Design a protein around this ligand. Structure first.
Ligand SMILES: Cc1ccc2c(c1[N+](=O)[O-])C(=O)C[C@@H](C(F)(F)F)O2
Length: 350
């Protein structure tokens, strides 16, 4: 059923996945959110939103566990690389799984991808003196894609056509790979970057670009999800009155953090925000207040140590207050069960 507690535990699974993939899959399975078969997890990982592409790659990229190996085989076996050049296939593979990072992870992803490519194109492998060259060429394409489209590497230090060629010299069991073969790859990658589909993290990146000042704090971690944006007015003193537009603050509520900001510069569909403060949802309580001067007040509190008053707002209207305080209150619950589950360290200390 579309139960609040039920839904809330789905999302708790996803958050565990986006921090500790092995733990998150266990969690989703132990509750019947995804089947305990490699095929079932495969389709989950590549079909369900709420899953970070970086950790789908960290999960599949694990070579030790046999289950993880088995799911990667189901993933590649559901991709069709026939009649494709090796880069055109990588474009399709890198579309679902981020291939980048710890070399042991990129090895196991590329290994699984190349094997699938060989099966879909036996005529291409016959053109090679050694079939393993397909792995080396694949890895090369990843690396070229990273460098050609890296902002830290300025054009002048970027890998040019003959740099690429020169690096793949004499690797096909002593012989070069055909120059016209490598040149097609380079032009195709040059014509459009191998991009991975956007996930919740790429929404958090957009936001974090628009907010100057931060205390860190990165903000775009894998587990963190944008939940809600809201315009409320900070109330320094809820016992004194204040002018209806004073202290206007734009509030970004993420699934485990509330960020308070003020508009820095407004313009035609282009706004920046100055970061003011952020609060952790662990131990937060959300109170409503109505008095002589504020009819839609919100007071936020930190019960964890005596009770602390974090911040007071007043929303524009009572509908906004009810949407905001409900979203924040469910996030606070979501975070409470995350730590209530995280005090599992009793089974980790023997
Ligand atoms: C420095 C600075 C800049 C803008 C601000 C504030 C502050 N500050 O003094 O912290 C506020 O406190 C509230 C608010 C308002 F403009 F409405 F008064 O916007």
């Amino acid at each position: 059923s579309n139960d609040v507690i039920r839904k809330r535990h789905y999302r708790i699974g996803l958050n565990l996945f986006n921090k500790k993939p092995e733990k998150g899959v266990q969690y989703l399975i132990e509750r019947g959110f995804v089947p305990d078969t490699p095929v079932g997890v495969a389709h989950f990982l590549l079909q369900r939103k709420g899953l970070s592409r970086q950790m789908i790659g960290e999960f599949l990229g694990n070579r030790q566990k046999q289950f993880n190996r088995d799911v990667l085989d189901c993933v590649v076996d559901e991709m069709d690389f026939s009649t494709m050049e090796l880069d055109e296939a990588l474009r399709k593979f890198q579309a679902h799984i981020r291939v980048q990072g710890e070399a042991q992870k990129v090895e196991r992803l590329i290994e699984a991808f190349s094997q699938r490519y060989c099966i879909c194109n036996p005529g291409v492998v016959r053109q090679f003196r050694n079939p393993d060259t397909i792995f080396i060429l694949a890895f090369a394409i990843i690396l070229l894609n990273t460098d050609m489209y890296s902002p830290n590497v300025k054009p002048e230090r970027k890998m040019k056509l003959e740099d690429f060629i020169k690096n793949l010299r004499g690797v096909d069991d002593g012989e070069d790979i055909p120059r016209e073969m490598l040149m097609g790859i380079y032009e195709r990658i040059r014509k459009r970057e191998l991009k991975t589909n956007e996930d919740h993290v790429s929404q958090v990146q957009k936001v974090e670009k628009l907010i100057v000042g931060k205390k860190g704090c990165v903000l775009s971690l894998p587990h963190r999800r944008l939940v809600c944006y809201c315009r409320l007015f900070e109330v320094p003193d809820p016992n004194k009155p204040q002018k209806l537009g004073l202290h206007q603050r734009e509030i970004f509520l993420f699934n485990d953090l509330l960020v308070v900001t003020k508009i820095f510069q407004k313009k035609k569909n282009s706004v920046t925000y100055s970061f003011r403060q952020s609060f952790s949802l662990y131990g937060m309580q959300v109170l409503l207040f109505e008095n002589q001067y504020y009819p839609n007040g919100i007071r936020l509190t930190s019960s964890v140590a005596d009770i602390k008053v974090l911040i007071n707002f007043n929303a524009p209207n009572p509908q906004d207050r009810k949407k905001f305080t409900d979203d924040l209150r469910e996030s606070i619950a979501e975070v409470q069960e995350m730590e209530k589950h995280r005090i599992e360290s009793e089974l980790e200390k023997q």
